[PDB]
C-alpha cells in the first residue's frame, strides 16, 4: 500500500507568526516508513512523531510535526521513504493549500 502525504501548517499562515508544520502520512503498509521534514532542502532536527496507529482498512498512519515560523523565503517540504515506492516522495508546503 502506497503512502498519501499532506504538508500543512496547524493554524492559518502568518509570516513571522510562530506555528507548527504537520506532515500527515497515510494509507501505507507495512508500518516501516522513514519521514523527514526539510527547511530549504535541509533536514529539520527536533521533529516529533505520533505513535504508530492503523485504520479500519488496516493501513497505517503517522503525523510528524515541527515548530516553525513562516516567512516568504523559507520553503518547507516533506520527504518520505517507503518500501512500496521506488524513489522517495517529496511534498512541498503551499500556504494556500
Amino acid at each position: 500500500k502506497t503512502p498519501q502525504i499532506q504538508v500543512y501548517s496547524r493554524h492559518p499562515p502568518e509570516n513571522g507568526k510562530p506555528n507548527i508544520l504537520n506532515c500527515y502520512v497515510t494509507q501505507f503498509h507495512p508500518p516501516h516508513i522513514e519521514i523527514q521534514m526539510l527547511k530549504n532542502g535541509k533536514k529539520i532536527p527536533k521533529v516529533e512523531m505520533s505513535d504508530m496507529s492503523f485504520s479500519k482498512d488496516w493501513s497505517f498512519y503517522i503525523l510528524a510535526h515541527t515548530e516553525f515560523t513562516p516567512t516568504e523565503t523559507d520553503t518547507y517540504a516533506c520527504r518520505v521513504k517507503h518500501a512500496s515506492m521506488a524513489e522517495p516522495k517529496t511534498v512541498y508546503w503551499d500556504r494556500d493549500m
Partner: protein, 275 residues
C-alpha cells in the same frame, strides 16, 4: 449518539529474533484512551486520555498481563501463517486484529466486532451473527476449520456481548465531559486569481471535532457535485481537524457561489461567501 470501544492490536515479526513487536491501542468513541508497545523502556498499558488517570495501578497490572499473553498469541499465530503461506522469517510479517463493540444512544448493544488481517489484507472475520467465520482465501480455512473444532467464536461472543459492553459503560461514565464534547468548525473563503479569466474559491473549515464534516459549494442554490476539488480530513495536531473545498469559478461571478458547512457541533449549518 452511537458509542464504541475498539482494540487495534498489531504484531510485526522482526527477522533474527524470537519475539515480535506487539502494539495494542484502545479507543473509546474513536479516540485513543489506552496503549501498549513492547519496544518501550519498561513496557506496560499506559493512559492516553486524562480521564484514564482515575484508574487504580492494579487495573494497569490486570491489563499488562493480558498484553503479555497476546504477545505469545501473536508470535505463535505469525509462525503458523508463515508456514500456511510458505514464507521466510528472513523478512518481517504483519498480523493485525480489530475487536470491540458498538452501542446505541441508549447504551444498548448494537454489534460485536472481531476481524483479523495478514500482510494488511483480510484473513478471518467473525460474522455479525457472532457464530460463523469468514475465511478470505484457501489458507484462512486451516484457521476457520481449526476455530470451529475448538469453538473459539463462543469465547468471543461471550466477551463482546458481556464484558466489552460493561467496560465501555464505565469509560463513557468516567470520561463523559470529554467524550460528549464537540468543536465547531471555523470557516472562511480564500481567493486565488489565475489564468484564462478564471479563479479558485477555497472554503476552509478549521479546528473542529469529531472528524465528520460536509463541505458543499452551490451556484445560487444549485449544488456543484462535479469539478469541486476536496482534501482528505487532516488532523491539526491539537486534537481537532481541518478540511477545505475548492471550485474553479469565473471572475466577478464571486457572489453567485455559496459555501455550506455541516457538523454535529454547530448551532446551525454554516453559510458563507467571499468577504
Amino acid at each position: 449518539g452511537p458509542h464504541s470501544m475498539r482494540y487495534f492490536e498489531t504484531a510485526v515479526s522482526r527477522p533474527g529474533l524470537e519475539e515480535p513487536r506487539y502494539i495494542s491501542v484502545g479507543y473509546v468513541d474513536n479516540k485513543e484512551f489506552v496503549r501498549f508497545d513492547s519496544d518501550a523502556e519498561n513496557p506496560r498499558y499506559e493512559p492516553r486520555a486524562p480521564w484514564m488517570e482515575q484508574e487504580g495501578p492494579e487495573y494497569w497490572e490486570r491489563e499488562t498481563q493480558k498484553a503479555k499473553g497476546q504477545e505469545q498469541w501473536f508470535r505463535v499465530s505469525l509462525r503458523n501463517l508463515l508456514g500456511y503461506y510458505n514464507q521466510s522469517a528472513g523478512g518481517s510479517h504483519t498480523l493485525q486484529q480489530m475487536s470491540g463493540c458498538d452501542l446505541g444512544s441508549d447504551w444498548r448493544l448494537l454489534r460485536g466486532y472481531l476481524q483479523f488481517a495478514y500482510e494488511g489484507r483480510d484473513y478471518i472475520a467473525l460474522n455479525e451473527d457472532l457464530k460463523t467465520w469468514t475465511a478470505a482465501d484457501m489458507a484462512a480455512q486451516i484457521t476457520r476449520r481449526k476455530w470451529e473444532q475448538s469453538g473459539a467464536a463462543e469465547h468471543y461472543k461471550a466477551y463482546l456481548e458481556g464484558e466489552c459492553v460493561e467496560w465501555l459503560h464505565r469509560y463513557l461514565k468516567n470520561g463523559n465531559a470529554t467524550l460528549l464534547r464537540t468543536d465547531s468548525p471555523k470557516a472562511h473563503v480564500t481567493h486565488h486569481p489565475r489564468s484564462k479569466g478564471e479563479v479558485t474559491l477555497r472554503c476552509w473549515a478549521l479546528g473542529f471535532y469529531p472528524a465528520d464534516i460536509t463541505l458543499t459549494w452551490q451556484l445560487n442554490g444549485e449544488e456543484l457535485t462535479q469539478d469541486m476539488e476536496l482534501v482528505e480530513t487532516r488532523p491539526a495536531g491539537d486534537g481537532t481537524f481541518q478540511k477545505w473545498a475548492s471550485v474553479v469559478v469565473p471572475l466577478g461571478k464571486e457572489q453567485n457561489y455559496t459555501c455550506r458547512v455541516y457538523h454535529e457541533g454547530l448551532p446551525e449549518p454554516l453559510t458563507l461567501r467571499w468577504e
